[PDB]
């Protein structure tokens, strides 16, 4: 709870000892990295491999493991490049720009439903519905099934986090069965009758039908969790700094640089991980083969050797080489989509709700993500 309110003081005490810190947290021993240059170096180095978030040969949660281990996020060469390239078509600059009409339309539709209420909960009323409708439309999930998708995403995201439990993993296995079965059926439908969606793109091409399913699940999860946190974290940031909120309101063209600073200051993803595939010397320490490396992206974004006054929120920072989307080969596939969703949501919100105000914010019990439980606001 004390860590959730302000994790950056905890990151600072680690950084003061060493930017690569040998320790153990929540029963997980390894190297915890808070330094920017150390984080960037590790992510860029292919000798630090991604790995399965549960033990490779574990069959305690057989279905959960099988779904997890097929995802590009946890695959190395050469399987990673194959999987990523096949999914990349839906997330190119040009394709992402073509989503703008639907995003803008969805944003206005959601703001319409609360416009006369003088109150809203940013997450459940705005942030989540937008991100959910968008990703489901891209993948090709009909509106009738999008509530099931929300359930699977929320359950499966927990299964990779430090805070996971036996009951979370047991639940995750059930949701893995449901999600895999569902997408298998949807793929069979699209195989007979292709539509204008990502699933049909995957069938054009190679890629097994299970791999296509697990790809859909990965993208559904990322679309439902992180993007929602980006929007909600940003709104809170701006409202806590009225000086720059007013600045942004006066010129919406600053939304680009503003969203980048929100990404740096309250990073939706606080952690990713690697395993050392061999002995590696970095920053004066030796990481032995098989040892685990935990990269604290939020902490690296507060490195004073890169960002002069790191704990100051400043939307005018240029450039802003934050590590919120990671770095290297696994760098976020959907970063352009996330940025667009956030830019349109925040600008339109500030435009339509000119007197926006905050209504003791609690964060979800996740250590690898920075996610608000809710964000009530008042306006007009």
């Amino acid at each position: 709870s004390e860590f959730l309110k302000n994790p950056y003081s905890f990151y600072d005490t680690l950084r003061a000892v060493h930017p690569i810190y040998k320790g153990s947290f929540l029963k997980y021993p390894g190297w915890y990295v808070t330094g920017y240059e150390e984080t960037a170096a590790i992510l860029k180095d292919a000798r630090f491999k991604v790995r399965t978030p549960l033990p490779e040969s574990s069959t305690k949660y057989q279905d959960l493991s099988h779904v997890q281990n097929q995802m590009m996020l946890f695959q190395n060469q050469p399987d990673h490049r194959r999987l990523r390239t096949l999914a990349s078509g839906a997330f190119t600059p040009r394709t992402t720009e073509s989503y703008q009409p639907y995003i803008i339309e969805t944003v206005h539709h959601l703001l319409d439903q609360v416009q006369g209420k003088k109150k809203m909960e940013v997450i459940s009323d705005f942030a989540f519905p937008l991100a959910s409708f968008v990703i489901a439309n891209i993948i090709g999930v009909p509106e009738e099934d999008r509530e099931q998708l929300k359930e699977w995403a929320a359950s499966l995201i927990q299964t990779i986090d430090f805070t996971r439990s036996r009951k979370a993993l047991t639940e995750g296995n059930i949701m893995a069965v449901q999600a895999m079965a569902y997408f298998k059926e949807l793929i069979q439908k699209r195989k007979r009758h292709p539509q204008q969606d990502m699933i049909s793109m995957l069938l054009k091409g190679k890629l097994t039908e299970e791999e296509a399913a697990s790809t859909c699940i990965l993208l559904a999860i990322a679309g439902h969790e992180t993007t929602v946190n980006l929007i909600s974290n940003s709104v809170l940031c701006l409202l806590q700094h009225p000086e720059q909120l007013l600045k942004l309101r006066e010129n919406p063209d600053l939304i680009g640089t503003a969203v980048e600073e929100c990404l740096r200051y309250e990073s939706p993803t606080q952690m990713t991980a690697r395993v050392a595939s061999e002995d590696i010397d970095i920053c004066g320490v030796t990481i032995r083969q098989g040892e685990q490396v935990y990269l604290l992206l939020g902490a690296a974004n507060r490195d004073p050797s890169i960002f002069t006054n790191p704990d100051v929120f400043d939307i005018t920072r240029s450039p802003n080489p934050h590590l919120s989307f990671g770095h290297g080969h696994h760098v976020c596939l959907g970063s352009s989509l996330a940025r667009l969703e956030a830019q349109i949501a925040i600008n339109t919100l500030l435009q339509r709700m000119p007197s926006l105000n905050l209504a003791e914010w609690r964060y979800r019990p996740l250590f690898g993500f920075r996610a608000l439980e809710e964000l009530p606001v008042t306006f007009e």
């Binding site: 153990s24 549960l54 040969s57």
Partner: protein
């Protein structure tokens, strides 16, 4: 019959977690070497013990324990 002792409660947790038969869960047996606990099993074992005996086991103390008897010793001393 009798109420479950510290030893019996510990051994039951180990047996249920590792799917291993009792009396194969002997004292002096190693979790990793003998009972075949992997890098999740050992985490889930500590969680299950923490809940069973309503206690917090520091990461430092968990690292010291590698055998069944040692786990029983820790719970008796705390």
């Amino acid at each position: 019959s009798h109420m479950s002792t510290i030893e019996e409660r510990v051994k039951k947790i180990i047996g249920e977690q590792l799917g291993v038969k009792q009396e194969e869960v002997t004292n002096n047996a190693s979790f990793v070497e003998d009972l075949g606990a992997d890098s999740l099993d050992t985490v889930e074992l500590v969680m299950a013990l923490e809940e069973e005996f309503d206690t917090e086991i520091p990461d430092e103390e968990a690292e010291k324990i590698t055998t069944v008897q040692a786990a029983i010793d820790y719970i008796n001393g705390h």
